[PDB]
Design a protein around this nucleic acid. Structure first.
Ligand SMILES: Nc1ncnc2c1ncn2[C@@H]1O[C@H](COP(=O)(O)OP(=O)(O)OP(O)(O)=S)[C@@H](O)[C@H]1O
Ligand SMILES: Nc1ncnc2c1ncn2[C@@H]1O[C@H](COP(=O)(O)OP(=O)(O)OP(O)(O)=S)[C@@H](O)[C@H]1O
Ligand SMILES: [Mg+2]
Ligand SMILES: [Mg+2]
Ligand SMILES: [Mg+2]
Ligand SMILES: [Mg+2]
Lengths: 358, 351, 359, 352
DNA sequence: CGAATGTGTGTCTCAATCCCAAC
DNA sequence: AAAGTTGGGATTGAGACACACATTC
């Protein structure tokens, strides 16, 4: 995930009748009053990557007076320049996806199909990794045990080995039919060459088992835990919290060590939960500091944190060099003073207006 | 004809969410003012980061105000440049330094001073972020044109220069025009060396702000500079460093039974009651509680008791050719012809 | 319903090894760090009223080092002074319930069953009416349709009729047992009068039981409650200076907001505007039943998701509120300390919470 | 032969409607109050609280307030102030904004006597006491009472609410006030001036319109400060001239007809500064009123489109059932009384 | 336009957990 | 007598599935 956004344009999308917003590399801070169009900008980006669902109603995203919606999105990933365009005129919708000038997909489903393979992330797992909504900062922590390690695989980069393991089943099976061409006929010296291909297909399965879940994925994930646990403590201690050290199990369940006992995230306060969820998400980023240079989007993370913890969190974000571009929404001033680019958003007549500052 | 270069006081910084660490910043700042008043220097050059925030507490504003009022009442002209923590971020709000407008000259341009019959050129500007460097270079080139007439000239900047802070530098070294002295800030490492037939100097912080700076305080005391610009030129000889008294820190990495002996003799052989940090083995903590009164606080941990290379290492441990696993790992992920690559392996290098 | 809290003591309850906290009438503000011990004070209030549940593990609520837990709570409701004492020594638990001094219940389940008789609210709806936790200020409005009117009835005092509807089920079904007691049973025939006398009476009792039902009079009384709430809802909502015509409240208590060129629902609003509607609605409900259910209300960090401006304007709202006798509020924000009547400061020395009350 | 100025409730930093223009209007009116005070050359200025609006006001409001009282102190005007409810520190170690004015203003928490043109006048005051610590306030007032009997001229500075003036949130009664020649009070923004205990009790109104319920008072009695002449041995209303400052005009309109629309335009044009309109306007009338969004500051007007005990019986009888039974049974079950003893009476006696 | 879709919702379930009382 | 042992009860999580809503070919 060498993910980075460039710019977005949006017409009649919720409160934004028309707005073009430029993104920059670094700590981009979007500030405004409540209901001023802050969260509405990221609902538009999510709309560009993944079309409207039943959960993403058009009547919900159309400007209540208007009857159409248009949005185009520029971004880079692994070096290529992409351009997604989505519209809904008067009942019909269309979508275009350009790759370095020339188009790549021309239908809505074709764009959705193209997005999920370029990102390697689907609609649902995109909300647990890149786009973290309000209060759902700890949602990644409390996920189901299967879902927790499922979204961890994408967060650590291991999920690309599962793409080989499934493409190996295509490879193993096809070399098996070249063996069926001898096996399906050897019934009803150079016999040694018959055994040369049989021992060769058997080799592929044990190679498929290497890329498998229990093979190298678990092995690499097991070797990743102490590193994340080290970075988790480095960032969590910045909150000057009174706890010995934060233990991270291999199942990515978090345990906090108190002096006279051991506590879990259930017992931790609303703010202490956020203190762990952020520092863990940064520990994952700091773990693969150069392997997976992913961008991060946050919607009001300093909520539930007191005056001091909001301040300390800013100094944490400033020393973070592992994430190239992290866009943060806040109604708090503790993050204006640490950002490089501050995007101010106000509202006039139910219509939002964007003012970019360099 | 002497002046003081001081910077990075960070008034209002409440380290560890602790009241004592907030006051420790005020005292050292008050003590810096006290020593400055005891010296009675002709000019005071504050080169940024006086406050820690843009909306500091009422106490920190009173402490700073009544401090710079004393300096102005003793006919000491104080020049300041706005720091990165002092540049207003929003529209209508003001910098905290605006309360000091009638006792301190906030530098965003040029100014000349008469000191016992000699013109000395002072110039400076606020903190320019790395984005607006091109505007900064035009401000520095203007300060160069207005300076060629004066043999004595000083430059006040609150930036980071490339060969000194590589992480967050906003200016390179060759963009700095010739000046006799460079009164800089924004890095808390106390730095003093020659640069372009002059002296480039970072006065450094006044109190230990970020934890990487007690290693300095034991080596390089924290405080301000006292520069003697009486002669026509400037050297390292005529610059005296003034050290202030800070909060002591005691670093311990107790994983052995010999690492408990290092504590008491160090905790007492320091000026004030220190702050302990690091790691302490769990078996040592209850017998360590006896001196928690001769310490301030203990932010110490209780301790109990490259994939491409690792993939091949794993395959060979299972008994499989790792170079094959890796080259295949690239063939399908890059969507190359695994057909053309697999057919070769079975023929030549198989058993 | 004249419910007001008085004071609470607690031993080894989570971070509180020992703490005694007195409450006063008015705008009570609980301030402290993150993890200082603010919410734990109300985890104890909930512990005294209702015993530990399976999810409310003792290991969850005992001080992780200690082995016992003690909590005694004083409070008032409809004018009487009550005192609850719950303990758990080393494996055994007990509960005491006093009324104006002398005891009423001595076993845990005896206290549990008794508390639910004086409050009229079980475990589930006490967290939706009186003790509103984090973020759930607005959850009640986006809730599931049946669950929404289920909790609307409790804060409206309508649930007092559902208790009749189910306790009426006792009478209808027990007076039917008085027929089977008769059915199985030169002198004869004065019981033909009893066939028409009791059967037409049971059909009457069930016909009365439908009056106390939800769709009978509860929904009817709820309909006659909406117009008053809708006006108060807008009077308090306009204090947030938001750009909308007026706030419409349906009979089913799902909210529609009138924009100039459109109409929006809580699904579309931003998080902070949901909280704005939620607090203004609960204050409108409170302003409605000024004497019917003059109950106390507890809020845990409501100004979260609200900007600097809404936090201030919300503070000027709470000052004009006279319908709620005692509203205790927790915040990590300073926007509410300046408007409170009593400021209960809660600090933590390492892992033990210590309270410094200023009157 | 002396004069002093009584001013209060400036609320520097108040950002009404989160609007920049309304924030500066507080600064300007305060600057102009200082301007008029400088023109008068008064001997003493009595500020009776609520100079700032918050405990952490903006730096701009701190600068504006400082440079004002520095002007007053350099001109040999002694300024006395008492902390208001918006200025009393809520936490411990943090300081009040008034501490920045220590070198220009005497913050009153006790007594002080001044010689002005050859006569001793007794000044005393205390900070804002919350309603809980009234007995501590009363203990301060009885102390200020004993220390004053020697002086025939005495003044009391308080930032509280007195019972006969604000019934909503008053913290002291009238009989708790000892006899003083003048009462310089605050915290209510309605300007009040009346006789009291053989003296003059006065509430210096606010300087700018803060809460919207205070334009009702602004048009009757203008906002500003008091100028008191304590030349005679005693004080009356004759030697008290109120000096009014100009505030932002507010225009209330109820345009739901065209007869109420001429009331708008003719008033919006016949007012001093760019006014603020509020109220309700029919949506079919709003867009032809939007033509004046240039001659107005802001538009806070609404766009408009176009007990149980009685009802339960009324409902039960309407369904065809004895409500008297429904009600009396409804009470029988809520208590733990015998429903059987109550129902068996109905089934026997009053049934059909 | 009707079918193919994921998306959420309500509700139902077996199963576990742990408090509470009892022998 | 004392100690665990034990079943009654309440809530919770994960796993199933028809019933919708809306997008999209
Ligand atoms: N279809 C729509 N037409 C017009 N306005 C809409 C529509 N849907 C939502 N809105 C408005 O868009 C605003 C929501 O924008 P947000 O970005 O969520 O607000 P916000 O500033 O982000 O506050 P947060 O961050 O969510 S707490 C609200 O004022 C809604 O009333
Ligand atoms: N069983 C326990 N033993 C000891 N400490 C505990 C236990 N359970 C929780 N804690 C700690 O007790 C503290 C109490 O925090 P809370 O109860 O959430 O109060 P609070 O943080 O002040 O209020 P909010 O609303 O949560 S921010 C936290 O730091 C927990 O980690
Ligand atoms: Mg700096
Ligand atoms: Mg600095
Ligand atoms: Mg006041
Ligand atoms: Mg006032």
């Amino acid at each position: 995930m060498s993910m980075i956004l460039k710019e977005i344009r949006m017409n009649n999308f919720k409160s934004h009748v028309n707005s073009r917003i430029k993104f920059e590399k670094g700590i981009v801070a979007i500030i405004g009053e409540n209901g001023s169009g802050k969260s509405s900008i990221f609902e538009a980006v999510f709309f560009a990557l993944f079309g409207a669902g039943s959960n993403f109603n058009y009547d919900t995203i159309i400007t209540k007076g208007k009857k159409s919606v248009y949005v185009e999105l520029d971004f880079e990933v692994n070096g290529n320049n992409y351009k997604i365009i989505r519209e809904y005129d008067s009942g019909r919708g269309g979508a275009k996806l350009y790759k370095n000038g020339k188009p790549y997909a021309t239908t809505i489903s074709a764009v959705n199909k193209a997005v999920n393979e370029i990102l390697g992330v689907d609609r649902n797992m995109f909300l647990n990794s890149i786009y973290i909504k309000q209060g759902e900062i700890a949602k990644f922590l409390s996920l189901k045990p299967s879902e927790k390690l499922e979204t961890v695989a994408k967060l650590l980069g291991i999920d690309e080995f599962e793409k080989c393991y499934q493409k190996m089943g295509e490879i193993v099976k096809e070399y098996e039919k070249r063996l069926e061409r001898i096996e399906g006929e050897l019934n009803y010296n150079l016999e040694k060459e018959k055994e040369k291909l049989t021992k060769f297909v058997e080799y592929l399965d044990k190679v498929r088992r290497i890329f498998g879940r229990n093979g190298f994925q678990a092995y690499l994930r097991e070797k990743y835990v102490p590193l994340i646990q080290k970075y988790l403590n480095e960032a969590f201690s910045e909150f000057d919290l009174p706890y010995s050290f934060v233990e991270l199990t291999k199942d990515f369940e978090v345990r906090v060590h108190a002096p006279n006992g051991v506590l879990t995230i259930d017992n931790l306060s609303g703010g202490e939960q956020i203190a762990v969820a952020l520092s863990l998400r940064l520990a994952i980023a700091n773990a693969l500091i150069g392997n997976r240079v992913e961008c991060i989007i946050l919607d009001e993370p300093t909520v539930y944190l007191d005056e001091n913890r909001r301040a300390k969190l800013a100094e944490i974000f400033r020393k973070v060099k592992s994430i190239p571009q992290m866009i943060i929404i806040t109604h708090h001033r503790e993050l204006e003073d640490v950002a490089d680019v501050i995007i101010n958003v106000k509202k006039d007549g139910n219509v939002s207006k964007v003012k970019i500052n360099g | 004809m002497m002046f003081v270069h001081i910077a990075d006081n960070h008034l209002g910084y409440r380290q560890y969410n602790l009241d004592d660490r907030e006051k420790d910043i005020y005292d050292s700042f008050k003590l810096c003012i006290k020593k400055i008043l005891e010296i009675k220097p002709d000019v005071v050059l504050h080169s940024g980061d006086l406050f820690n925030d843009l909306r500091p507490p009422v106490k920190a504003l009173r402490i700073a105000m009544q401090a710079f009022k004393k300096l102005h009442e003793n006919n000491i002209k104080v020049y300041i440049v706005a720091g990165n923590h002092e540049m207003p971020r929003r529209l209508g709000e003001e910098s905290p330094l605006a309360l000091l407008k009638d006792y301190v000259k906030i530098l965003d341009g040029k100014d000349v001073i008469n000191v016992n019959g000699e013109e000395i050129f002072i110039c400076g500007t606020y903190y320019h972020k790395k984005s607006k460097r091109e505007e900064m270079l035009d401000k520095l080139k203007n300060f160069e044109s207005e300076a060629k007439n004066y043999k004595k000239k000083i430059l006040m900047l609150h930036q980071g220069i490339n060969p000194y802070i590589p992480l967050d530098y906003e200016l390179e070294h060759f963009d700095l025009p010739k000046f006799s002295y460079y009164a800089l800030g924004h890095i808390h490492k106390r730095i003093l060396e020659r640069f372009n037939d002059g002296i480039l100097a970072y006065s450094g912080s006044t109190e230990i702000i970020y934890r990487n700076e007690y290693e300095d305080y034991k080596k390089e005391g924290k405080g301000f500079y006292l520069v003697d610009f009486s002669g026509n030129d400037l050297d390292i000889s005529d610059i005296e460093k003034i050290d202030i008294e800070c909060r002591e820190f005691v670093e311990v990495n107790i994983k052995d039974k010999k690492s408990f002996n290092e504590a008491v003799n160090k905790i007492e052989r320091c000026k004030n009651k220190p702050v302990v940090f690091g790691k302490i083995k769990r078996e040592f903590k209850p017998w360590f509680d006896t001196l928690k009164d001769k310490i301030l606080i203990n932010k110490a941990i209780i301790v109990d008791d490259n994939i491409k290379e690792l993939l091949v290492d794993y395959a060979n441990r299972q008994g499989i050719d790792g170079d094959l696993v890796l080259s295949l790992y690239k063939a399908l992920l890059n969507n190359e012809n695994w057909k053309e690559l697999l057919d070769e392996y079975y023929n030549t290098k198989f058993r």
